[PDB]
CSV table of C-alpha atoms in Angstrom, one decimal:
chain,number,residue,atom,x,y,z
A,1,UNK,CA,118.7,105.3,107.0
A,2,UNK,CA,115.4,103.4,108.0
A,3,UNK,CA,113.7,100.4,107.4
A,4,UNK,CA,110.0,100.5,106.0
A,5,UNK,CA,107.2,99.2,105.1
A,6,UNK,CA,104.2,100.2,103.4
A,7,UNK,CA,100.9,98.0,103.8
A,8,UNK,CA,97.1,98.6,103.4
A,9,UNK,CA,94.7,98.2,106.7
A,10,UNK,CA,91.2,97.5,106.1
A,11,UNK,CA,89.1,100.0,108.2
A,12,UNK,CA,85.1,100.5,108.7
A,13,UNK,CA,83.5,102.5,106.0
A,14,UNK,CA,80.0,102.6,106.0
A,15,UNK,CA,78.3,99.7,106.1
A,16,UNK,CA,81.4,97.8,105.0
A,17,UNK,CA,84.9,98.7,105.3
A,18,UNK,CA,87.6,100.5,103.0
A,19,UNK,CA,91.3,100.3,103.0
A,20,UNK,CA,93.7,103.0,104.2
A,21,UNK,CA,97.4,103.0,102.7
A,22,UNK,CA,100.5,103.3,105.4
A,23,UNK,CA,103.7,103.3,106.3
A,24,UNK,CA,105.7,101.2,109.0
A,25,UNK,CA,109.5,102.4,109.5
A,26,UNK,CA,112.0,101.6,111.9
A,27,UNK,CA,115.6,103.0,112.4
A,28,UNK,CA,118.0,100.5,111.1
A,29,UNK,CA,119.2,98.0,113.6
A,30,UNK,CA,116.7,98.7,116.1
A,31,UNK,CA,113.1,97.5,117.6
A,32,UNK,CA,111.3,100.2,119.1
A,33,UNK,CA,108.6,100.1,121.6
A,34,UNK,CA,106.9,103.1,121.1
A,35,UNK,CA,105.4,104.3,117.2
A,36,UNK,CA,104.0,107.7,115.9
A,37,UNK,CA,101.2,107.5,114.2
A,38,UNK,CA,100.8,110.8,112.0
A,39,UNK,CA,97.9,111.7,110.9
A,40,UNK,CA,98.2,114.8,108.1
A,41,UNK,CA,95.6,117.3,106.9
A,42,UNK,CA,93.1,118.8,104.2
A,43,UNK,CA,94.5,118.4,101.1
A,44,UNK,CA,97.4,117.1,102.0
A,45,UNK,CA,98.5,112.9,102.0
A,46,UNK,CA,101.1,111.0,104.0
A,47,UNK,CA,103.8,113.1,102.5
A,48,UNK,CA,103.1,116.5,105.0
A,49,UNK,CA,104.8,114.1,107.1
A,50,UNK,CA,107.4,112.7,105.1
A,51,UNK,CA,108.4,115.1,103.1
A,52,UNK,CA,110.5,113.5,100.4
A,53,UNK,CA,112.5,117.1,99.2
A,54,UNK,CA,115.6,117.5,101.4
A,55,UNK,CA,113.8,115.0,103.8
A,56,UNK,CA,117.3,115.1,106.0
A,57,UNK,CA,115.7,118.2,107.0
A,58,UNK,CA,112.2,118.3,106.1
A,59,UNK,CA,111.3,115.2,106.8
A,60,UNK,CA,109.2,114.8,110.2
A,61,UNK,CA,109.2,110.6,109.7
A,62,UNK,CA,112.8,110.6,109.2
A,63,UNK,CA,113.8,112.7,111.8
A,64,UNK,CA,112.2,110.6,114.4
A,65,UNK,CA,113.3,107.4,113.1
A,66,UNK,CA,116.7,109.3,113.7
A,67,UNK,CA,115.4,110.1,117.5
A,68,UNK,CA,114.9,106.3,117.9
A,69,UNK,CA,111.1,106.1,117.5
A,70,UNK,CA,109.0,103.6,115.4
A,71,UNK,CA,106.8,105.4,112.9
A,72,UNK,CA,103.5,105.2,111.1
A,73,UNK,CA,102.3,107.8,108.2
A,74,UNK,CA,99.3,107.4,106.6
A,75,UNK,CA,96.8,108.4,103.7
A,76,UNK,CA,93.3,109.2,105.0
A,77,UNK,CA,90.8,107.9,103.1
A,78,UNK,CA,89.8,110.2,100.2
A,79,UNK,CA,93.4,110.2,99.2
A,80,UNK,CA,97.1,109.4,97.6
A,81,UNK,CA,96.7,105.5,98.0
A,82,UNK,CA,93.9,104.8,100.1
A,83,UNK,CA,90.0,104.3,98.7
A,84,UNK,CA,88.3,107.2,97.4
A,85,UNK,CA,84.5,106.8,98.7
A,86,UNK,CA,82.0,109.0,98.0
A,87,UNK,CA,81.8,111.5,100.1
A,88,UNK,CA,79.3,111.4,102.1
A,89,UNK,CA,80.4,108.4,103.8
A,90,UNK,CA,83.5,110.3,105.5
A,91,UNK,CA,83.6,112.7,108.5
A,92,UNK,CA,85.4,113.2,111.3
A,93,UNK,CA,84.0,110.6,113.5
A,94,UNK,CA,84.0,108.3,110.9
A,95,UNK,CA,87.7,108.6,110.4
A,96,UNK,CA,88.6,109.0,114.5
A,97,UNK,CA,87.4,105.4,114.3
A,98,UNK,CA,89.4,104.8,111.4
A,99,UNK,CA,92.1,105.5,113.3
A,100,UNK,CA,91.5,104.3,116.4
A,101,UNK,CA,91.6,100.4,114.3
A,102,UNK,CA,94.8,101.4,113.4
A,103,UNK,CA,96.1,102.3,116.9
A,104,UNK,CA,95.0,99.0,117.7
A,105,UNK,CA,96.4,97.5,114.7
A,106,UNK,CA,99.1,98.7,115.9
A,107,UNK,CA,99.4,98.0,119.3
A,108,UNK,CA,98.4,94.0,118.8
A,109,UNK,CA,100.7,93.8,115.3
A,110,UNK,CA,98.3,93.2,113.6
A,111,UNK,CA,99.9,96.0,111.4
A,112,UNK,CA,104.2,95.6,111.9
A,113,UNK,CA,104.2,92.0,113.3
A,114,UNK,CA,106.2,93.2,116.5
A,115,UNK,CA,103.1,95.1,118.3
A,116,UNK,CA,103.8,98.1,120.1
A,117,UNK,CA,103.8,99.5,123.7
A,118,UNK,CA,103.0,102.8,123.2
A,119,UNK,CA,101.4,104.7,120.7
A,120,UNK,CA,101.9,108.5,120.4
A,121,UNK,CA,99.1,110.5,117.7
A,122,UNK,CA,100.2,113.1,115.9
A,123,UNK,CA,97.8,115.3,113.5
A,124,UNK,CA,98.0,118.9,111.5
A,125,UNK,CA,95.3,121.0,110.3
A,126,UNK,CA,91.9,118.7,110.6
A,127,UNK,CA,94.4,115.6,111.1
A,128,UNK,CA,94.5,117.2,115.1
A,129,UNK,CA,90.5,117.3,114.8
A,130,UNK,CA,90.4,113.5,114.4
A,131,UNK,CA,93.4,113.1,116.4
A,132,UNK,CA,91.6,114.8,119.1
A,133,UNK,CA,88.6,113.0,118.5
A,134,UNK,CA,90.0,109.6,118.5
A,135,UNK,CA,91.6,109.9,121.9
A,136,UNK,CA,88.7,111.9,123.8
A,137,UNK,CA,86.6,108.9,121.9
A,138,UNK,CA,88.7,105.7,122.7
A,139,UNK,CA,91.3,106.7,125.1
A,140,UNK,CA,93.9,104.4,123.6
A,141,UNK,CA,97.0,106.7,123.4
A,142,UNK,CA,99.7,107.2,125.4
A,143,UNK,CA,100.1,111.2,123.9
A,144,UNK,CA,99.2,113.3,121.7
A,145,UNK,CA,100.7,116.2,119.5
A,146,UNK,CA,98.3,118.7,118.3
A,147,UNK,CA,99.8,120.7,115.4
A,148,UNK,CA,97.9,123.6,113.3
A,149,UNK,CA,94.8,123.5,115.3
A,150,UNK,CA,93.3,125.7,117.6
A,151,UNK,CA,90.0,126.5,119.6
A,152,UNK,CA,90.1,129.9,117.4
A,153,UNK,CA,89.8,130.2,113.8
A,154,UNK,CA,90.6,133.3,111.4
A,155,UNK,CA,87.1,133.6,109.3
A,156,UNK,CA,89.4,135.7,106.5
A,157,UNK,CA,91.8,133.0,106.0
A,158,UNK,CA,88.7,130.3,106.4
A,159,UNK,CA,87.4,132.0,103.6
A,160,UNK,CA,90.6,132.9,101.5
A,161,UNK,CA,90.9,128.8,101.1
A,162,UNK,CA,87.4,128.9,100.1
A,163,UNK,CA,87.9,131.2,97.5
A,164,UNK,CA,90.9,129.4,96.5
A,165,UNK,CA,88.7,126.1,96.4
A,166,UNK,CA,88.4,123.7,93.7
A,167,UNK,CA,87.0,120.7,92.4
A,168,UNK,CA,90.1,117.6,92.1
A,169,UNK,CA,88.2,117.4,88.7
A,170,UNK,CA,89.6,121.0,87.0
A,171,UNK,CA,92.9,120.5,88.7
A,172,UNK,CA,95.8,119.6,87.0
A,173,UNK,CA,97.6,117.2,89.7
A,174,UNK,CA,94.6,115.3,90.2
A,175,UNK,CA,92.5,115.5,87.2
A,176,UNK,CA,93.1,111.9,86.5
A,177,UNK,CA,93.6,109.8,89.2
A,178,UNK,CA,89.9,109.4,89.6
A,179,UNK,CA,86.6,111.2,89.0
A,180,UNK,CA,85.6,113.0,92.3
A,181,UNK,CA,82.0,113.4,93.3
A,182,UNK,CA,80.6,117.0,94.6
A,183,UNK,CA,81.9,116.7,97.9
A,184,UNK,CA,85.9,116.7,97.0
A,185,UNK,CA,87.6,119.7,96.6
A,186,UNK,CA,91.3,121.1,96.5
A,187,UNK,CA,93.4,124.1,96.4
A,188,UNK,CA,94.2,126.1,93.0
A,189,UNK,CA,97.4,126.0,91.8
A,190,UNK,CA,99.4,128.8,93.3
A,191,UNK,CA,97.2,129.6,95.8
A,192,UNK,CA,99.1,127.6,98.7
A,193,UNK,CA,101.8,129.7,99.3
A,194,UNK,CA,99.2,133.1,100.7
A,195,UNK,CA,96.2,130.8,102.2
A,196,UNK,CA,98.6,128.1,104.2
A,197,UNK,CA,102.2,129.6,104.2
A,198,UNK,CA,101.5,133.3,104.6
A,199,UNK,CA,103.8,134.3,101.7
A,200,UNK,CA,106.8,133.9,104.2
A,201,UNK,CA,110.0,132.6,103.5
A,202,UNK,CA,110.5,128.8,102.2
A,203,UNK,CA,112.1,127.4,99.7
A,204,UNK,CA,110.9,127.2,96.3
A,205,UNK,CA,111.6,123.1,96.2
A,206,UNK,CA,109.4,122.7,99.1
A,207,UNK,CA,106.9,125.0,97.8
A,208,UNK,CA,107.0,123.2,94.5
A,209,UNK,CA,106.9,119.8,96.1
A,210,UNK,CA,104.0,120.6,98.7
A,211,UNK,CA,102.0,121.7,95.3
A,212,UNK,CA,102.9,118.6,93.0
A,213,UNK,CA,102.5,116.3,96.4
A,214,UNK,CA,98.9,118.0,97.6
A,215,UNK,CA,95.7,115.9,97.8
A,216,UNK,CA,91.4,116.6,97.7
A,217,UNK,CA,89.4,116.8,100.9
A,218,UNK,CA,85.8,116.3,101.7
A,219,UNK,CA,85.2,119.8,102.7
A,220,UNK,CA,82.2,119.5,104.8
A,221,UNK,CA,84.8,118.4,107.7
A,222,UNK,CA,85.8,121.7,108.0
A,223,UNK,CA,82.4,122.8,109.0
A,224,UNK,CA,81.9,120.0,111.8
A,225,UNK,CA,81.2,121.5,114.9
A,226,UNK,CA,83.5,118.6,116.9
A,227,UNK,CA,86.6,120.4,115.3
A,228,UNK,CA,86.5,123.3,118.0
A,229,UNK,CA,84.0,121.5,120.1
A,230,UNK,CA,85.4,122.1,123.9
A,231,UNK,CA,84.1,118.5,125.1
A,232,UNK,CA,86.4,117.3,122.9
A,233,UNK,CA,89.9,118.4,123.8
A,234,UNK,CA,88.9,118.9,127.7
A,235,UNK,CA,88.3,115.0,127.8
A,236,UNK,CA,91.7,114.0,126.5
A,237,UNK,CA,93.6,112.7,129.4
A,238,UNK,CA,97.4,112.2,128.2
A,239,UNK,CA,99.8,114.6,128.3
A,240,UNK,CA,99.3,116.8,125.0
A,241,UNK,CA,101.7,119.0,122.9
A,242,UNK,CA,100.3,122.2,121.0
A,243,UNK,CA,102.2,123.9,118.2
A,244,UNK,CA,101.3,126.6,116.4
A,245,UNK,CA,102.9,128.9,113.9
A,246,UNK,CA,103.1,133.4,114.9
A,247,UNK,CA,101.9,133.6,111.2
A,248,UNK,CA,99.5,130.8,110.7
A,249,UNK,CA,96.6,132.6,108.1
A,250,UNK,CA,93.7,130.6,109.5
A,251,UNK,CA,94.6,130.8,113.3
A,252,UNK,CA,96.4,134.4,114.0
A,253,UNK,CA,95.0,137.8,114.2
A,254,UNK,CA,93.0,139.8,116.1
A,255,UNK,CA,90.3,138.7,118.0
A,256,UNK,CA,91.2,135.0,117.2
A,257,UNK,CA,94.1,132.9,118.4
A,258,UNK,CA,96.5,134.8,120.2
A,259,UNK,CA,99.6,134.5,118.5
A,260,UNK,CA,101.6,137.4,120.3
A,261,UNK,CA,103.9,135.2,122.6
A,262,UNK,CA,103.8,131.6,123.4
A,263,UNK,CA,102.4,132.5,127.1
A,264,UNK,CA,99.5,133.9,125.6
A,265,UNK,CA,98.8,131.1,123.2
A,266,UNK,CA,99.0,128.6,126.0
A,267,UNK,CA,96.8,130.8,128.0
A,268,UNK,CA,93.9,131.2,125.8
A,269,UNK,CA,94.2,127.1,124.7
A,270,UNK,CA,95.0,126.0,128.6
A,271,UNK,CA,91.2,126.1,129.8
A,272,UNK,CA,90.1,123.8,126.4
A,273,UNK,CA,93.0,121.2,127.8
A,274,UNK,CA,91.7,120.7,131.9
A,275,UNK,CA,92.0,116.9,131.8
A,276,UNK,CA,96.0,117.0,130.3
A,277,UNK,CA,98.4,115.7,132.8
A,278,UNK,CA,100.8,118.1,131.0
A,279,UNK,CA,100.4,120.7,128.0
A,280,UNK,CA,103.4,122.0,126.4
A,281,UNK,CA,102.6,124.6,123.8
A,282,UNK,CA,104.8,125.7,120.9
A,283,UNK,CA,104.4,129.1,119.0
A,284,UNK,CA,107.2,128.6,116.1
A,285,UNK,CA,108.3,132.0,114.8
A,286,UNK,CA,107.6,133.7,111.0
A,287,UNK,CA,105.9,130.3,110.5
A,288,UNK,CA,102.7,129.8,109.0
A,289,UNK,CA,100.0,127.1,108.6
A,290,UNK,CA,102.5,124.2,107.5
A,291,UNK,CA,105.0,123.7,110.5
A,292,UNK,CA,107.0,120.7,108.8
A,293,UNK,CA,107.8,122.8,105.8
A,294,UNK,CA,109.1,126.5,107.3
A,295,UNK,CA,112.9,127.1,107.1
A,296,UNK,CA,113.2,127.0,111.1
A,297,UNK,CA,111.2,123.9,111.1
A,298,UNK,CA,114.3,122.2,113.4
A,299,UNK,CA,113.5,124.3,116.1
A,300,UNK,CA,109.9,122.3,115.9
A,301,UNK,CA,111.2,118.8,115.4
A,302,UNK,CA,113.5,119.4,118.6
A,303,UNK,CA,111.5,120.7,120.8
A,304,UNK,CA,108.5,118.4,119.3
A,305,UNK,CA,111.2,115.3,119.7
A,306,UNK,CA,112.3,116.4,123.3
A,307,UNK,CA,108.5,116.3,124.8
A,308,UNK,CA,108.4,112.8,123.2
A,309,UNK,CA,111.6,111.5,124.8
A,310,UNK,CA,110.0,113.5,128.2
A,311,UNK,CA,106.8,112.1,128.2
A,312,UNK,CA,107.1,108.5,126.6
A,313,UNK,CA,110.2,107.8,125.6
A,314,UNK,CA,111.2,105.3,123.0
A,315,UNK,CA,111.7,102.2,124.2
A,316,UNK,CA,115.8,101.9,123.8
A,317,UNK,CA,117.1,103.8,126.4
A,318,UNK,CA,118.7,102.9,129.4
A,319,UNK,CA,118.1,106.2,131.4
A,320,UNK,CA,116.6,107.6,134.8
């Protein structure tokens, strides 16, 4: 049981700046010298991450505060606690270099007072888009884990969120938290369980929770060419981790990403990854879109925890 923080950084937004709500936890009795940063996805917040039902097991944060790493969730801007712009002043880029002040923030402590050695990014969905931006961009992290993201996309399940789409405005979770502009949208209530989870097994409290705990996106993201953009990915230059779920609606099927083994996934992502020192790819099994939130999600968060501990380490070991 951990010891947090949450704080506000200010970050460039526009022509000024806005601010962007986080988290800072340590495990108890402990100063670690590498942090996660965890960066979630459309229409989601910080909680993807930390997932407060049954978090012992559902719970990403918490689990590697448990593994001896530093942590750091946060809520892109658009959502949960952070400024809501107007839309039109967010996009990827924008937001890689959101993030890349944080990772700095971070690594100075500026943000947590101790600073940090390392830095490990971690993203899900279009959180893996400005993941993968922010290091090709500013080369500032010592890893990077790519979750729910790949160079292939399922049109039908692309389109079976759209159809599911919403303005925050008509929803009933976020009618009154603010009044969104035109370029917000969510998910319909009911809808996530087909167009992120596949229908396949989880538990109703997660299901229930991920509904009353989901968020608006600026939806033009999703059509930003950088998100499968090859120069992208194949300039990244730390080792990367890629994890996928066999069932993930907007990856899997035929004639998109190849979800029929985990030697096939990793060779149809390998040649969009030439720069990596390493790539360790994942396919989690019966698992859609949402990795964090499936019933076998342990199998994730250890082999997820085990690449870590491989490839930077935490800080507190004494090991050769």
């Amino acid at each position: 049981s951990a010891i947090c923080r949450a704080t506000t950084v200010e970050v460039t937004l526009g022509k000024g700046t806005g601010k962007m709500w986080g988290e800072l936890c340590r495990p108890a009795g402990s100063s670690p010298d590498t942090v996660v940063t965890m960066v979630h996805g459309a229409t989601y917040n910080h909680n993807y991450w930390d997932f407060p039902y049954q978090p012992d097991k559902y719970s990403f944060r918490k689990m590697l505060n448990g593994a001896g790493y530093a942590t750091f969730v946060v809520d892109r801007l658009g959502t949960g606690n952070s400024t809501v712009p107007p839309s039109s002043e967010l996009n990827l880029t924008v937001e890689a270099r959101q993030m890349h002040e944080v990772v700095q923030g971070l690594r100075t402590g500026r943000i947590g007072g101790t600073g940090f050695g390392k830095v490990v990014l971690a993203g899900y969905s279009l959180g893996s888009a400005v993941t993968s931006i922010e290091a090709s961009t500013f080369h500032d992290v010592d890893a990077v884990l790519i979750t729910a993201l790949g160079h292939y996309n399922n049109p039908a399940g692309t389109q079976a969120i759209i159809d599911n789409g919403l303005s925050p405005n008509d929803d009933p979770v976020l009618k009154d938290r603010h009044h969104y502009d035109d370029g917000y949208a969510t998910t319909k209530p009911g809808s996530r369980k087909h167009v992120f989870y596949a229908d396949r097994p989880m538990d109703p409290g997660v299901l229930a929770t991920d509904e009353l705990t989901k968020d608006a996106n600026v939806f033009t993201e999703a059509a930003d060419p950088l998100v499968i953009d090859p120069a992208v990915s194949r300039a990244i230059d730390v080792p990367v981790m890629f994890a996928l779920g066999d069932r993930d609606p907007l990856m899997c099927g035929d004639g998109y990403e190849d979800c029929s083994s985990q030697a096939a996934l990793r060779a149809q992502e390998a040649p969009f990854w030439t720069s990596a020192p390493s790539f360790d790819v994942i396919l989690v099994e019966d698992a859609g879109h949402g990795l964090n939130l499936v019933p076998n999600t342990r199998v994730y968060q250890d082999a997820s925890r085990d690449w870590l501990d491989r490839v930077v380490g935490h800080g507190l070991e004494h090991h050769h």
